[PDB]
Amino acid sequence: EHQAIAKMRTMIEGFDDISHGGLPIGRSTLVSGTSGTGKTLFSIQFLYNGIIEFDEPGVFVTFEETPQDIIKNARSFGWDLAKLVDEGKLFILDASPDPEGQEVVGGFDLSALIERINYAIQKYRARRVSIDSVTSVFQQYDASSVVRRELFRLVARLKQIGATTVMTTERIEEYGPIARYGVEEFVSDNVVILRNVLEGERRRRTLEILKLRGTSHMKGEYPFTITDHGINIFPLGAMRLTQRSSN
Amino acid sequence: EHQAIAKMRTMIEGFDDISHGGLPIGRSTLVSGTSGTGKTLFSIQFLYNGIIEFDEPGVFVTFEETPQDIIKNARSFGWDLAKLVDEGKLFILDASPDPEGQEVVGGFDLSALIERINYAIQKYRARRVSIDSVTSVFQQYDASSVVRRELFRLVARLKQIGATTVMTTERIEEYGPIARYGVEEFVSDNVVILRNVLEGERRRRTLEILKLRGTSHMKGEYPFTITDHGINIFPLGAMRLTQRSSN
Amino acid sequence: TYILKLYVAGNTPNSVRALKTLKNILEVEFQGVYALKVIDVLKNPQLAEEDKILATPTLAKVLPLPVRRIIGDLSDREKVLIGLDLLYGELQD
Amino acid sequence: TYILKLYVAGNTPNSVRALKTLKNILEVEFQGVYALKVIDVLKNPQLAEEDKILATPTLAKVLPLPVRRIIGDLSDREKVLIGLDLLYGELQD
Amino acid sequence: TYILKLYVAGNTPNSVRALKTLKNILEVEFQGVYALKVIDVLKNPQLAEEDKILATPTLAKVLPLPVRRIIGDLSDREKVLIGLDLLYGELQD
C-alpha cells in the first residue's frame, strides 16, 4: 500500500537474514554467477520451499536443461519434483531447444513464450517463478536486441501479474562484469551474485546481495556450501548476543 | 530409476576418489586443458581400463591424431591397443583429415559422422566413448554454429544410447576460460580441468573437477603426474584415519 | 498437404509477416493443399512446451509425413521459405 | 566418366538438391558418361569413415583418374557445381 | 481511417517532409479516410510526455484499433512509410 516493499521468505538458510526478510515481493531478482556456482540450485530451492513451506505454487521456466534432467538432478537434494508436478503445485515449462532447430530472423518467439509463461502462472496460481539461464535464450538469438527487450517485456509482464521471480544468468569472471551480455540492465530491480573463487588451488563459494531496490540488505560476500539439503549460508554479521549466562 | 545418478569407475588412480565413484553414467564429461596437459591420455586410459577391468568395449573418435599414432603413442604406458582392436574390444574411429581437403559450406558432415559414431557403438556394444579434440572439429568449420549444435546433436545422441563419454578440448590459459570456443556450453553436464601451471620455471600438473551435475565431488585442484602407467593423482583430503595402533 | 501449424508470439507482425511468406510459398506448390493454422503461444503455452518449442515465431508440420520443427526468432524468414521450397522440391523429388 | 559417388545424410533434400545440380552439371559435359551413385551414410557409415568422410553431403570421385573428395555441409552447392565445371574444363584442357 | 496524429519538432522540414510521405502513403490506401493531425510538441509537451513520446518527429495512431507509436528521429522515413503500407496490407489482410 503506502508501505515500503515487503519480502517473501526463501527459507534458504542464511539468505533471509542477509536479505532482511527475503526477496522483494512482486519483483525480479537476478542471480548471476559463473558456471557451476549454484544458480539453478538457488532457483529450484526458491520454488520448492515456497511449495513445501507455504503451499505457494511455482513455475520453473527452463532454457538450458530439459525438465527430465531438472527433476533427476534435484534428487541430489532429496527433493521429489515429479510428485509436486503430479500434484499440480509445480509446473516446469520447457523452453530448452530441439537439437534440430534451424535458421531464424525475428524475436517474436518470444512474444508467444511470454504468453505461455503468463498462462502457466494463472493456470497453476503460481506466486513464485524461476527463469533459468537467461544467457541461453540470448545465445539462441545472438544477443540481438530483439531478445534484449523481449526480455524487458517478460520482466514487465511478470511484474504486472505480481509474480515474485528469480532469473539466473551466467558471467565469465569471478570479479568482473555482473552478467554476460549485460543482463542486469533488464532484470535490474535486485541483483544477487554467486561466486566460486579460487583461493590458491582451493575453491570458496560466496553469495553477495549487490542491490535490492527500495529496501535494506547486508553487504559484501558471505560464504556458503552446497549440501545434500541445498544451499547453506552463514550469517557472521547477523548474529546477536541475546544468549543467557549463569554462575 | 528413482535414484540419484550412478557412476562408472575410471580406475584412474585417485580420480574415482575425487569424483566420489567415477564418471556419471550415460552422460558426457568435458576434459579441458592447455596443450600437453594429458587430455588424450585421460580419454584413452578411461577406455582401456573399461576394457581390461570390466570387459566394457570402447569407441575412440579421433579428430586430431591418426589411429596409427594413437596406438603407437599408447605404447608409452604399456598399453597394447592394436591387440584390443584386433579382439574387437576397442574401435578407433578416424575423423582426423586428409591433408588434401578443400573448401566447404555446410555442417552436414557431420550428421553423417554422428551416425557412424552411433553405428560403431552398437556394432562393438560399447559402453564407454572418448571424443578427442573437440577444438579440432571446431577449427575445420571455423567455429561456425553449424559445428556448434552439430556438437549438441552429438552430445544428445550419445545420451540417448546411454553411452558414457569423455570429450577432450583445448584451452589457452591455465587460469582463464574453461574451453576455447565455449565448448563447455554443449558438453555441459560435467567439467574436468587439467592444468600445467608454471611455478617459477617449474611445471606442476593438476586436475580439478569443476562440476558434476546431480552429484557430489571433491573441489579445487589436485596434483598429479604422468607415469609409465598413465595418470597418477593423489587424494590428500580423501585420506582416512582408520589405521590401527599398538604398544 | 499437411496439417501445418505456426506458433506466433501474439500474432506479432513478424509472425504475420512470416505467415504471409509461408502462405505464399505454400500456396505455390501444388494440389493436396496444406492447412495453415496458427497457434497462439500466449493462449496455450502447454503444447509449445511439449514440442519443447521454446522459440517464436516457429512453424511445425505434424503430418502427413514425419514431423519437423522449423524455428528461429530471427527473420531468416525469406531464407526459411526458400528452404521450405527446397523441401517441397524434395517432396517433389 | 567416372565412377562418381555422392554421400547423403538420409537422402536429405539438400543432398537431393545438390544431386540434381551435380547430375545437371555432369550431364552437360560430354561423352564418357559419369556414373552417379549415392551412398547412404546411414546405411554404411563404415566406408564413410575410411574415406574419413565426416561431412555430408559430400561427393567423391573414385575413378577414372585420381580420387578427390568434395564436401562442405553448406550448400556452396551451385558454386561447387561451377568448380566441378572448371575441373571438367581442365579435364577438357 | 484512423484518428492519426503526428508530433513535430516545430514543423521542422523533416517533419513536414515525413508528413508528406505519410500523407501520400495514407491517401493511397482506401476509403475510410484517415485524419492526419499534427501536434506541435512545442505547443503541448505535456501530452507528448504522457505518451512518453520523447522523440521527434513521431507518429501515433490513436484509433480506430489499438494504439501504436511510430517514431525515430532519423528519416527512416520512406522505409517507415513502407512499413505503414505493410501494416495497411495487414489491415488489408
Swiss-Prot record, chains A, B:
Highest taxon of source: Bacteria
Impact reported for A238V: Increased endogenous ATPase
Miscellaneous comment as given in the Swiss-Prot or TrEMBL entry: 'Kai' means 'cycle' in Japanese.
Membrane spanning stretches: none
Recorded consequence of changing A95E: No longer binds KaiB, no formation of KaiCBA, still phosphorylated
Induction profile: Transcribed in a circadian rhythm with maximal expression at 12 hours and minimal expression 12 hours later; expressed as a kaiB-kaiC opperon, this gene does not have its own promoter. Autorepresses expression. Negatively regulated by labA. Non-phosphorylatable kaiC mutants still down-regulate the kaiBC operon.
Annotated spans, B-loop, required to bind KaiB and SasA: 102-109
Reported effect, T29S: Extends the period of the circadian rhythm to 28 hours in reconstituted KaiABC complex. Decreased endogenous ATPase
Residues of the full protein shown: 14 to 260 of 519
Free-text comment on this protein's domains from its UniProt entry: In the homohexamer the 2 domains (called CI and CII, joined by a linker) self-associate to each form a 'donut' layer; the compactness and local conformation of the domains varies over the cell cycle and impacts function. CII has the autokinase and autophosphatase activities, both CI and CII have (weak) ATPase activity; CI has the clock pacemaker role. The CI ring undergoes structural changes driven by ATP hydrolysis that together with the KaiC phosphorylation state regulate KaiB binding. In the homohexamer the 2 domains (called CI and CII) self-associate to each form a 'donut' layer; the compactness and local conformation of the domains varies over the cell cycle and impacts function. CII has the autokinase and autophosphatase activities, both CI and CII have (weak) ATPase activity; CI has the clock pacemaker role.
Family per similarity comment: Belongs to the KaiC family.
UniProt name for this protein: Circadian clock oscillator protein KaiC
Quaternary data: Homohexamer resembling 2 stacked donuts with a central pore nearly blocked on one side; hexamerization is dependent on ATP-binding. Binds 12 ATP; 6 between each subunit in both layers. KaiB only binds to phospho-Ser-431 KaiC (not doubly phosphorylated KaiC). Complex formation between KaiB and KaiC is regulated by the phosphorylation state of KaiC and by an ATP hydrolysis-driven conformation change in the CI ring of KaiC; complex formation is slow. Slow complex formation is crucial for the timing of the circadian period.
From Swiss-Prot, chains C, D, E:
Membrane topology term: Peripheral membrane protein
Keywords recorded for this protein, A-Z: Biological rhythms, Cell membrane, Cytoplasm, Membrane
MF-aspect GO terms: identical protein binding
Keyword Ribosomal protein among UniProt keywords: no
Domain of life: Bacteria
Result of altering R69W: In kaiB2; shortens the period of the circadian rhythm to 22 hours
InterPro entries, sorted: Circ_KaiB, KaiB-like, KaiB_domain, Thioredoxin-like_sf
Chief localisation class: cytoplasm
Disruption phenotype: Not essential for growth on low light, loss of circadian cycle and rhythmicity. Cells elongate.
Subcellular location(s) per record: Cytoplasm; Cell membrane
Regulation: induction: Transcribed in a circadian rhythm with maximal expression at 12 hours and minimal expression 12 hours later; expressed as a kaiB-kaiC opperon. Down-regulated by KaiC.
GO CC annotations on file: cytoplasm; plasma membrane
Keyword Cell membrane part of the UniProt annotation: yes
The protein's assembly and partners: Undergoes a major conformational rearrangment; in the free state forms homotetramers with 2 dimers. When bound to the CI domain of KaiC switches to a monomeric thioredoxin-fold (KaiB(fs)). Monomers, homodimers and homotetramers are detected in solution; at low concentrations only monomers are seen. In vitro forms KaiC(6):KaiB(1) and KaiC(6):KaiB(6) complexes. Only associates with 'Ser-431'-phosphorylated KaiC (and not with doubly phosphorylated KaiC).
Protein's job: Key component of the KaiABC oscillator complex, which constitutes the main circadian regulator in cyanobacteria. Complex composition changes during the circadian cycle to control KaiC phosphorylation. KaiA stimulates KaiC autophosphorylation, while KaiB sequesters KaiA, leading to KaiC autodephosphorylation. KaiA binding to the KaiC CII domain yields KaiA(2-4):KaiC(6) complexes which stimulate KaiC autophosphorylation. Phospho-Ser-431 KaiC accumulation triggers binding of KaiB to form the KaiB(6):KaiC(6) complex, leading to changes in the output regulators CikA and SasA.
Notes on the domains: The C-terminal region may confer species specificity; C-terminal hybrids do not all rescue deletions in S.elongatus PCC 7942. Has 2 forms, fold switches to a thioredoxin-like fold (KaiB(fs)) when bound to KaiC. The KaiB(fs) form binds faster to KaiC than wild-type, thus less fully phosphorylated KaiC forms; the KaiB(fs) form activates signaling through CikA and inhibits signaling through SasA. A mutant locked in the KaiB(fs) form binds the CikA PsR domain.
Protein name (database record): Circadian clock oscillator protein KaiB
Gene name of this polypeptide: kaiB
